[PDB]
Amino acid sequence: HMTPPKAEKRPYPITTHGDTRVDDYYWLRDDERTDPQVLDYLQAENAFTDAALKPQQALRETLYEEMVARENLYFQSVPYVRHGYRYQTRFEPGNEYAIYVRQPQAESEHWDTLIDGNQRAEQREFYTLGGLEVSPDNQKLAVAEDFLSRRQYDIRFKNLSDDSWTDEVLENTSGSFEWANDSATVYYVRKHAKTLLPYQVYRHVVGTDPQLDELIYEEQDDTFYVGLEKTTSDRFILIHLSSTTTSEILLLDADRADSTPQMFVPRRKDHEYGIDHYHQHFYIRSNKDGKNFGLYQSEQADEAQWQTLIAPRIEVMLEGFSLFRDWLVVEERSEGLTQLRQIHWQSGEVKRIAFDDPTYTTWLAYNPEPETELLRYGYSSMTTPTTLYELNLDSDERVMLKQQEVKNFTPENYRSERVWVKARDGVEVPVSLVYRHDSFARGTNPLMVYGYGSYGSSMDPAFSASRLSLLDRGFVFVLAHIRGGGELGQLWYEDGKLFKKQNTFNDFIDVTEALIAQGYGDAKRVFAMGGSAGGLLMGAVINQAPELFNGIVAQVPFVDVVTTMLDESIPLTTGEYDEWGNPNQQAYYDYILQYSPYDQVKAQDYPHMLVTTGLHDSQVQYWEPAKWVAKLRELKTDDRQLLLYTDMDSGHGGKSGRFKAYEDIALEYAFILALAE
């Protein structure tokens, strides 16, 4: 019925390597965000989406209500102990924000409020708590807060003796800070006042005018993130410098006055390392000798003196480690599973943590004190809501500390499988899927296939409460563990980026085709979703295999890839040459252009699609999805649904916006369910 919005065409030629591309919608980019013609097109598309989805209002309400009905209003964190105090985080129904409390470890009865987010948010438009830490002497609270929504954190200090605040604010910080052992000095990271990248380390004396703060270090390469850490031993504060490929650490003596940074290992392209310090040794996770990382012990910085504890292995990715009195614990990936292993410092005894589930994830949880035999670790599966366990590393006694509460949920109603798909190049691609048993009939259920596939980020199999709204309406829900992700380690990542990026899209198509061929779902009712770099996935797969999918949800999608990667004025671009490549080089221009979804839109039939973006914030800038929809409307030959939904909100809510997050999920799921009917 209704005529969709038609963006004005303004042919804008871009010539690179002699190749002229004509962009009719280049003008939808307005960095100042005030062009009235640009806002008219976004608003027009919002009105069209509103109009087209109006019949789905009742379904959106039903979905919203059933999603919120699974969740407990009252949430209390698992208490932890640090420096002789016990800490809990509390959410009350009709409180917008968490309250952070504590008590002395030997106390049971009384809890003291550290910070009430509801009191801090009073008379403000926006509030996000970026982080919180009491000083070693238990007397001062440091907090990083954003009142403006720009992810620029103010750091302030509270005297816990009388609940008074000090007079100073540390402004435009990353929220990264560490206490010196004097409980009087803090190190913090300042963002660049233009690019907002973290780039300077300052030393501040609490109570004092920040004009007196000393500049400790400035990073000259803005592809390197600047973070601060504190070692398990408390002996060093670390300046942690890292790009996508390359690390460097500098050490600050946490005990002595006037510390200056001490080099650990000077940066070297493609050497990624991270350190800790404990038991008078440095512990180093490093890829110096293999892409899957090894763990080393050293007395000194000198890389030539690093002793091998765990050699890099082709079959096992080393992700991280924690240090305890008697045990090393590592988190690893092997054969498409996450795993924890513990190794005794003295006996060399190795233990593996056993589970029994085809599609689960396990990880090291928060372990702030090393002088303990108790390990806290997380678990989640497609069928088992997220759980925190405490394991005695000596006795193997495993105790549940907390389970995610899911109302109106019977876990035995659902089944999950791990499936391996031989891809078109013969590489085995893992898949994790879950469905409701009593509505499953082979070849008849709609599929929802979810992928990401960039940055070596893994779409680890884990429990989703909102997902039950699809499973309880007959959907088979699929995680496709495609190349460019991290599920099979660093080589799985490298075989899905740069001159291998097309493998991500091929793997998504190959998994989808296999699951249809094998009878997991209805060939006519296959749906897909991905966001950001997963939106690039959605955009490439519908250009390449438009007939495979009934309908698509592309969130904040990265689709204008060649044009964006040619322009260093766009945020992310300078830091993403080691992901997609640098199209200033003809080899990368050609390789990227081949999949760049905006460039490869053709006059062909597409699936139904809902596309989302945001005006006021961005990771992908709002214009890429708007230009993409404009071009799809111009060229596509089908009469299927194409909708753009642009978030106009001037900012966020409680840590993201929970009400809003469920409203967004309900709108997307109603769109998909209406197509599946």
Count of CB atoms within 10 A of residue 27's CB?
18
Shortest CA distance to 615 belongs to which of 644, 646, 645, 643? Answer: 646
Reported structure resolution in angstroms: 1.7
Count of CB atoms within 10 A of residue 212's CB?
10
Amino acid residing at 11: P
CA dihedral of residues 487, 672, 29, 580 (deg, nearest 10): 20
Residues 642, 648, 653, 656, CA torsion sign: positive
Sheet holding 551-555, edge to edge: 414-422, 428-436, 476-480, 447-450, 526-531, 551-555, 608-614, 642-647
Count of CB atoms within 10 A of residue 3's CB?
6
Paired with 164 in beta bridges are 159
Q: What are the φ/ψ torsions at residue 572 (nearest 5 degrees)?
A: 85, -30
Q: Is 31 a catalytic residue?
A: no
Which residues have C-beta within 8 Å of that of residue 608, sequence separation ≥ 6?
A: 550, 551, 552, 640, 641, 642, 675
- The helix (H) or strand (E) run that includes residue 384 is none
Amino acid residing at 322: S
What's the CA gap between 42 and 332, in Å, rounded? Answer: 45
The two structure tokens encoding residue 256:
């002595």
Q: What are the φ/ψ torsions at residue 283 (nearest 5 degrees)?
A: -115, 130
What's the CA gap between 81 and 267, in Å, rounded? Answer: 36
What's the CA gap between 235 and 233, in Å, rounded? Answer: 5
Name the E strands within 71-184.
75-76, 80-82, 85-91, 99-104, 112-116, 128-134, 140-146, 153-159, 164-165, 170-179
Q: Which CATH class is domain 70-403?
A: mainly beta
Query: From residue 49, how far is each of 44, 337, 627 by CA, in Å?
Result: 9, 41, 16
Shortest CA distance to 158 belongs to which of 124, 134, 186? Answer: 134
What's the CA gap between 604 and 547, in Å, rounded? Answer: 10
Which residues have C-beta within 8 Å of that of residue 347, sequence separation ≥ 6?
A: none
Query: CB–CB of 333/319 below 8 Å?
Result: yes
- With H, G, I as helix, E, B as strand and everything else as coil, classify residue 378: strand
Q: What are the φ/ψ torsions at residue 305 (nearest 5 degrees)?
A: -100, 0
CA dihedral of residues 23, 28, 31, 36 (deg, nearest 10): 150
What's the CA gap between 218 and 667, in Å, rounded? Answer: 45
What's the CA gap between 460 and 531, in Å, rounded? Answer: 16
Query: CB–CB of 525/532 below 8 Å?
Result: no
Name the E strands within 291-336.
294-298, 307-310, 317-323, 327-334
Query: CB–CB of 486/458 below 8 Å?
Result: yes
User: Exactly one of 617, 618, 647, 664 is catalytic; which is it?
Assistant: 617
What's the CA gap between 274 and 264, in Å, rounded? Answer: 10
Q: Is 652 a catalytic residue?
A: yes
User: Exactly one of 532, 560, 596, 599 is catalytic; which is it?
Assistant: 532
- With H, G, I as helix, E, B as strand and everything else as coil, classify residue 436: strand
The two structure tokens encoding residue 214:
């000393």
